Amino acid sequence: DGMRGLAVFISDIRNCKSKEAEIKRINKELANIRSKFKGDKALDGYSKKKYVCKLLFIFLLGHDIDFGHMEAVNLLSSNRYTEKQIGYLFISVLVNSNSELIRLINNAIKNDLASRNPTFMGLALHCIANVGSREMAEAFAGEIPKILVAGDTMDSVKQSAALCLLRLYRTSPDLVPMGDWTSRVVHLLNDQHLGVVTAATSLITTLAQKNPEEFKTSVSLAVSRLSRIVTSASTDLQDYTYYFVPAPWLSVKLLRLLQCYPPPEDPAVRGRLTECLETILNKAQEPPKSKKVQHSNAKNAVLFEAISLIIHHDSEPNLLVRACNQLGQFLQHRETNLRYLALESMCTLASSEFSHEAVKTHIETVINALKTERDVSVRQRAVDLLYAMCDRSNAQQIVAEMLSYLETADYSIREEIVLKVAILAEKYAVDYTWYVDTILNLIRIAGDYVSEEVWYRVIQIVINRDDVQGYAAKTVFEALQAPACHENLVKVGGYILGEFGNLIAGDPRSSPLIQFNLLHSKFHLCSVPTRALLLSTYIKFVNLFPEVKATIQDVLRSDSQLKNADVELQQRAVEYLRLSTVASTDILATVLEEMPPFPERESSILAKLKKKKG
Amino acid sequence: PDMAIMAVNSFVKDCEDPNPLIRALAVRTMGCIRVDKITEYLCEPLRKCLKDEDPYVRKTAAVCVAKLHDINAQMVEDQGFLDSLRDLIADSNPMVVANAVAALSEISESHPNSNLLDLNPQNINKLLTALNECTEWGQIFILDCLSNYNPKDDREAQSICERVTPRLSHANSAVVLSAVKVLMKFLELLPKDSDYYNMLLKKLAPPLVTLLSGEPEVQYVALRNINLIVQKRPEILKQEIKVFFVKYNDPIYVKLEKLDIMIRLASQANIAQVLAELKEYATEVDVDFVRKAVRAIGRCAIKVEQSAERCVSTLLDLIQTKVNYVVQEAIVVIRDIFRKYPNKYESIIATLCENLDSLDEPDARAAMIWIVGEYAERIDNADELLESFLEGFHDESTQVQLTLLTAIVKLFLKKPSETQELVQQVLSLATQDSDNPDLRDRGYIYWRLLSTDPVTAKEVVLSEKPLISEETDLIEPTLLDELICHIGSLASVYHKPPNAFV
Amino acid sequence: MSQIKRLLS
Amino acid sequence: MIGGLFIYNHKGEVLISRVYRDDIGRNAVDAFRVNVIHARQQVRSPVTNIARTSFFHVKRSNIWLAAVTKQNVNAAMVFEFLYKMCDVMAAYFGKISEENIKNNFVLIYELLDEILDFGYPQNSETGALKTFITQQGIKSQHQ
Amino acid sequence: WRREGIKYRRNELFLDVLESVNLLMSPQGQVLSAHVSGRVVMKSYLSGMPECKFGMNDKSIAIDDCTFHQCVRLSKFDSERSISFIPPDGEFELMRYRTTKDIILPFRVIPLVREVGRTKLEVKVVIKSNFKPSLLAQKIEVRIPTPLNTSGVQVICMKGKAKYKASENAIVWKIKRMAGMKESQISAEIELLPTNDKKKWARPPISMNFEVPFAPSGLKVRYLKVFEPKLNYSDHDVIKWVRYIGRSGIYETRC
Amino acid sequence: MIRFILIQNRAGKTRLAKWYMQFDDDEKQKLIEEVHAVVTVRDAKHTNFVEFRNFKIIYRRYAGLYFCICVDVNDNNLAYLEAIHNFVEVLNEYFHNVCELDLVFNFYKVYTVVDEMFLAGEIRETSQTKVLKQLLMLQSLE
Amino acid sequence: DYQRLN
């Protein structure tokens, strides 16, 4: 085209040797343009254009512009295309607040939509869609639908107005009612120009999120269009045929739209759809019609969105199975892109009865991936899969592997991983000895990355389940013996031996005295909440084991305990001391009674996973 | 790691050639690539390099011991290299014994509680002769090992202490700190004798002082350690208080630490000039510093009487500013003043209750809540005050919850008639609703206590407290002892055991 | 180094 | 002892790096950039811990010199070493900046091998290691 | 830190100097330990980001320790051309400093203790101003600490208002204004009742509070030249006012 | 929907930025920094899809350039990956042996190409030939 | 109080 001076200017910037060369050169051009704009006459159109485009390039460079908004606005009103183009583009990039400019802009848009030249209409629509201002919604949100339907406006215009209305819906929904257009809009799916279909599809798709009954008519038409697409021959639809594939992006979009609804109300339509879907599955398994990668990428793109529809409906078991085997093949495929995608897709399959058992067949390859992949993002989707497919049978080995992953897994995920294991173990608890163990492994492994909610739960379970209480007592006591011990272990073990230390005080290796003396090795090492707990736990012992009372009372009467700088620690130390000193047998022992069970609630562990994404 | 294995034949031919300088190149590269496959070709080159005519090859080979220890290290050759490194400790050159000590120390981390078992005079006297010669860094490694050693009796401690005593050292930080670690463990030698103890502590003060003349990062390291040294034996640094006054362009981390030290070294005498500093510190620029200062004003009140009135008065002047975080830090420290000086400072409460509307920090809320607890009888509207928090008992810190429980029952034991529904609500929340099993615990404890016998409950909960007494942010004495053993090290910078970083 | 290098083949 | 020495620019790109130990994975270089270089608070301290990984640091003009370890090192010793490192670079190639780092890809790593084997500080001075290190031809006088 | 183009109707500036004079004094009357902490606030309201050169009597002697705002640059190829900086708009803390030498104490306070056995206790405290007789000391408070066993106190003061506070164990003597080189006095009679006879009463010192309109370091602002290249105006155009405020700090005596 | 489209060079110069939802200046600057830091280090071994907050970015290398689209988490990865190529191929036929500098000097033209193929965050036109029909015919007119 | 400055 041209742009007088632009080339020269960009060449000068490249010809710069430094930061200050660049800067001083730019301030030069800015001063030139400002001297010329600021009252240095009225220039001809080409002149205005060439200077505004330079300012635009300056701003895109990263240096800040404080003028030329006036000037861009002028260019909008020209009948030369190139002048309007730079003009519209300028305000599409450098947005201003001023109320006299927003007005002038809007009047300039309106007078372009006023022409029946589709080119000028084009730039106005594109402008609205790319800035999406409230003031532009308030101006045009009425007139946009009218132009989309109703009269014979051009094909290119219908495309822009569809997406334009879509943007206005997103920005200011209170200004897009559900009027008369409803019917005519849907019929756009049956237009000759596929670009109008491509556009309209996406608008209907988003509108159906809050208005499914309103766009219900779309279902039938969406189907018949899609099946007509996958039926057509090699040189049909030549415009919209990408790398030996029929309208890939549109196929995807239509499948997307079908996910905005259940499976179709009528028998005949649902027939056409399932036939069409069986064909899509077949075409993937067929020989590759080209060597070049664009073919396989674009074809698979369609396959995956079809799979998504199959999983959405959760209807036809035949399809659910073929999808499972197909995704199966992709799990070991050489493209990292496809492996990532297959693990992603399979996750949603797993939470479905008809498919659940098919998913499980491949479990070993998934485990292979987790261990082998030398990525992270992929390995993560592999774990996400395991979690999702996990039930009664799997849990045993799935938890073992998740535990082993946690060992080499990065710092940030850990918290999430821990939380996940602690759910699976709790949900699929065959023997609660395995739960207690699993949790205690999570402690010695992560522990830092445990969570309060997690260790809260194991204790709730422990006191609620009865049988495992002795186990807990033994395993806890035995793991407290090991020297490289984590704090949250001391917390769990502290509370547990407080309540159930009596279940292990028979054995001379785990006597009352030995239990207390073990805990007190960790007392000074631990934080305040933990020390507070050990204090509760210490008087619980005084009740349970009169043999040790003397020793515990001397530690409670110690100056460090009674004069303790923290409030709780001194309050507990005194309350528990006065109990043991004064009172009576039965008044002590009613206060320090076996503890009633926890009532049933939601998992705070669940609530925290759900919290972690927002 | 993947690249090297294919041409292992090069690095075995390269360590054998003449020229003593270019024999360490092959020796150090061989140990850095980590494989099982390389153990096939490494055994016999490592044997011959450990006694080399030149000290350069011995220096590097002594390092390659600890390199091999990372990979499949349970061999009859590893039993051979146990010998090969110890005999290298009685070596003529300092750059050889330095590395031998370093490798062996790091290997002692693969511990069966029976590794490099100190052989007393025969082991010790060679180290204390080599320590005088040793290179800048060598001195460090040697001293860090000495910290393992325990003596039996007085002369045993002395004849080691006397040797290290000349350490007002060149490597101003690195050496000196490690030497303090040794000298502070070996400090049980007639708890005060006639002459040696009373002079050892005189000799330990000036090199601690002149540590402050190094760079800012080692100023920090030193001050973290000085914080510990002052806690164990404060008599070392008694009147050196004037050194730890915060100089104006000190980096923030140094400011914070110096301020803490100042507080511990404050006394009945010097308080006048310490406060003079504190008031100024309160007006400064950094928030976290301001906090530690206002906290420290309270800490003075607790540490020294008479300054009681002054400190409280300036703290109230600070509350009057209505700068939120100033008020929150102050109202926290005022709790602890009430605990050291009970029934004296009641009148403040009124002025405090003004501010309660705007306390977002957990510490502050808990402070205020407890204040209402102890002083319920004097505040007519204690009932309604505590009742305000209950609304959001969950979505509130564990510290607050526990304190609220305790405070409410305090009230109820004092005002049982006008309290009924309050305690019922809180004990319900603490019991049925609550998720911290330890909170639920104490819920039941109190419920059961109150509902069994209020004659007894009164005597248990509202028993006359002892006094908190000059502690003022003090560290746990037993933990301190362990931390002292780790003086030069990272644990002394953090004030946590090594068991808090595996 | 060859901003100048062509984007496809 | 020292299981990683990384040197950044002000923007947080990695100018040089040298991992010495198995204990510290490569992602630690990111962990320094994320939580300290681009920390929201510019009011910190020299020594930081994240994921049981300890981070030493000292600045010269706009260049971060950082040390990394999982161990309980003599903390004084690490800073001391970083200082004696900043002493060596001055007598060998003048000013502390990105230009002098890009010149000395060859020098930096050879110095790293002589002063530091497997995390242990060996020995350092301009004289005793002059012909035991090979430099260049003409230095950096510009700025 | 002085962003965009500043615009104001008339270009003026204000300087605030804030000093807290700390002091411990012996009962006889000996200047034994005392320093002044200081800080300089500038509230400059001026158009377009300018340069400033600020000056004062350091080395008419006196200046221990000091620090500046980051805007200041003390070196431009070695030495210093005084303080030299590119000020932010409005209110900011320019510098913070300390001084110990040539001390200038605003008040001298003089106790007289005289006990009658162990029953009665006679007190006479006198205060003197030590600054310009033309100038205006405000918010004077003198706190005389009474013993812990005190039956009752009798007080009269020649200027101001004074009262014995039972709780705070002190006589509080307030004077709303006092000018230089003048004198005033309080006299008090304190009654007692002896119990333990050995905890020898660690006599707390007498404290003073005051605001003064002079800098008790001896520091005074010599000049501050304001320069502006882009625009037209300079140092004769700007109206400059300076204020000295002497906060009390810790001002003890009779120790 | 598309959140934004970036074309960045190895260095960090952002030769095209289309924003499909209004971020702050500071926000944008950071997005530019972030996208760069992630993409530049990743070899052909690594996938073209990377989750990034709770958006996700698709990228592809061509010469020293990086073509990055930012999309919602539910949007089809591969679809967008090949839409990138669809676009680049248009650029090559419109610029005849297209390179980085072609986009610098004809930036104002690049935007015209982008906006034919993408509008308001969604895809507009897939048909390569039809875009070029609207480019060449109706470049001509002043 | 405020006095004027040369």
Numbering used by the authors:
A (entry chain A): 8 to 621
B (entry chain B): 81 to 582
C (entry chain Q): 2 to 10
D (entry chain N): 1 to 143
E (entry chain M): 161 to 219, 251 to 446
F (entry chain S): 1 to 142
G (entry chain P): 1 to 6
Paper excerpt:
The 300 kDa heterotetrameric AP2 complex (α, β2, μ2, and σ2 subunits) is essential for CCV formation.
Thus, it is likely that in the cell, unphosphorylated AP2 exists in equilibrium between open and open+ (and possibly other) forms with only the open+ form compatible with μ2T156 phosphorylation.
